[PDB]
Symmetry: none
Subunit: 26 residues, 3 copies
Amino acid sequence: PPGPPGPQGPKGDKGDPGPPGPPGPP
Amino acid sequence: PGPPGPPGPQGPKGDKGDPGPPGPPGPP
Amino acid sequence: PPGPPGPPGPQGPKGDKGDPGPPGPPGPPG
């Protein structure tokens, strides 16, 4: 009989860093 | 009974981060 | 003998959300 399911796969890559924030107020 | 199968697939890439904080108030 | 290797495991977790971006530029001189 074939054996049990394998282990959980690795975590995905971290998402890309976000963009610079907006300018401050004048 | 056979041994455990190979590892599962790598998970998907995370979501893009948020835009950063607003910059500092301008000076006079 | 022991049977053939079994099925693949579950999908790994999604990656963490990315870091926030850098601070925005200083506002214009008023």
